[PDB]
């Protein structure tokens, strides 16, 4: 057969079981306005990733502290979270993870990091600027609004040298 048959693929998001729920609609619209999200698939993606992290943390927490698997997996998970900036550096216990929330994921988006740096007037302005390729990360132009910046690259985000 064609080698293209062995290529993998998967979905990335989940839809709520009860759609018409007033508080949920209000909160989702509030978040969309605050962070200027395009559609409601982004929130579903964030919820999916958060659920994955929470499930991993639960499974690890069920075990004993001195379980080799627990140590290995918790160390990897904490390192990833710290490198990504989602979890604060000073927290190094698996319990703290279960308290995380999607807003922490959102705060690490490129729009957010360039807005808190005073490099853009607004999230909408940030998106428009990102599309036109006036921005760079570590000397490389990034035009994806949902691109997530690691902590080590936070000070390396600047305006594109070649942009007008």
């Amino acid at each position: 057969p064609r080698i293209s048959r062995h290529r993998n693929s998967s979905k990335t998001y989940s839809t709520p079981k009860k759609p018409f729920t007033k508080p949920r609609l209000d909160a989702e619209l509030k978040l969309c306005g605050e962070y200027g999200l395009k559609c409601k698939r982004e929130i579903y993606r964030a919820r999916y990733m958060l659920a994955k992290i929470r499930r991993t943390a639960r499974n690890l927490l069920t075990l004993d502290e001195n379980d080799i698997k627990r140590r290995f997996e918790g160390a990897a998970l904490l390192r990833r979270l710290h490198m990504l900036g989602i979890l604060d550096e000073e927290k190094d216990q698996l319990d703290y993870v279960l308290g995380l929330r999607i807003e922490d994921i959102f705060k690490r988006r490129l729009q957010s990091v360039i807005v808190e740096s005073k490099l853009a007037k607004s999230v909408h302005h940030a998106r428009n600027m990102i599309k036109a390729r006036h921005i760079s990360v570590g000397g490389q132009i990034v035009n994806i609004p949902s691109y997530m910046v690691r902590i080590s690259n936070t000070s390396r985000v600047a305006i594109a040298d070649t942009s007008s």
Binding site: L29, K30, C32, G33, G36, L37, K38, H124, R127
Partner: protein
């Protein structure tokens, strides 16, 4: 006895709204900033009367 006995006004020309993320901006402003007494509803007679 004739089917279709039950089956004329022209369409009013108005500027198209801003589609995409912009639609989310005005909806946010419609019911979180811009004013919508007697509590509030969505397009009851009284609210529509004032704008007319």
């Amino acid at each position: 006895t004739s089917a279709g006995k039950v089956r004329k006004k022209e369409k009013k020309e108005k500027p198209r709204p801003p589609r995409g993320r912009a639609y989310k901006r005005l909806l946010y402003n419609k019911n979180f900033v811009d004013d919508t007494h007697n509590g509030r509803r969505l397009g009851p007679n009284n609210l529509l009367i004032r704008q007319k």
